[PDB]
Symmetry: C3
Subunit: 138 residues, 3 copies
């Protein structure tokens, strides 16, 4: 069909907006807050989905950051790689290939974000990529 709007909301009430398409056993879902743009004819700007410490579960093990969500859809997605920028508490930052999934636990959707080791605690993760998940239902 045509693309339907939706959103998830984080623990700190951040709204993550998306559009989706739901066919037979298929759900395709794109996050739409950070679609990058050419702002003039020579410059491309990435936009970030910004996720702070307070959006993650504690304790964090093995560079796995879990973002409990409310609302939206309940899918076991595949893993997608993304561009991350991981900001440490001392404001240093590392660009990384991150790996993201949507999973369901206790009937709730969670975003799983895995990245590499950093020399410090993380203040914030920015997803700089446009994320789209193709998912199989049932």
């Amino acid at each position: 069909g045509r693309a339907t709007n939706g959103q998830f909301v984080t623990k700190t009430a951040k709204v993550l907006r998306y559009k989706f398409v739901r066919w037979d056993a298929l759900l395709i879902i794109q996050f739409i807050d950070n679609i990058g743009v050419m702002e003039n004819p020579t410059f491309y700007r990435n936009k970030s989905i910004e996720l702070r410490s307070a959006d993650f579960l504690s304790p964090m093990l093995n560079n796995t950051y879990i973002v409990p969500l409310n609302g939206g859809v309940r899918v076991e997605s595949p893993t997608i790689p993304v561009q991350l920028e991981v900001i440490l508490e001392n404001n240093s930052s590392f660009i990384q290939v991150g790996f993201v999934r949507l999973t369901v636990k206790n009937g709730n959707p969670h975003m799983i974000i895995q990245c590499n080791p950093v020399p410090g605690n993380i203040k914030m993760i920015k997803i700089k990529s446009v994320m789209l998940f193709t998912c199989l239902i049932g």
Copy 2:
């Protein structure tokens, strides 16, 4: 339609299970053995598809590991990046961004896994990502 079960089998008789959907010129296929889970409310476990030396062709050139398969479907897929853990014979291991495709040769499906150089011979590759391929047929 609804999602149909299938599998490939490796040279050592490892079974790689998947579900798929086949529409007009479109085949979407997800490997389902290693769907990660939140096992309690704070911990996410990745699962691995584990591929050993004996599942690969010899000789291996340019960090390209070829896994001949039997059964399943015959597709020329796009390339997907994945999380790999590459275990060396001396049990050291390296986490890498791997790149995976399905290709067909002599009427047989093969999984192509490319990764980075490692200081040793590889005993095992673990794919820690949930893999889904969207493929164009004909």
Copy 3:
């Protein structure tokens, strides 16, 4: 439906061929010039989509290479990661995980290619991955 042929053309008249499928709000598009092959039973060859300096806009900021295109389709795609080889003017080269999108500016399609810093100016970028974009329209 069945897969339709198309192409984009670069500033230097390089033709980038693709096949696509356009359903309701959905456009799936695969670039087809560099489908890798097993050429004998033990060897896999990657093929490259080769993009030179003259195919990019100037000035280049933040390791973002913008390839203005003509013809083809007009989509705001998600970001896909790919295998790049980035060739410097002194012929040294770096293998990287690149991130690619299609975007539209002034009614024209552009391919956005982002990679990592390199110690020199880039002569050429080779995309060694088979690229397929799943896109949401409207």
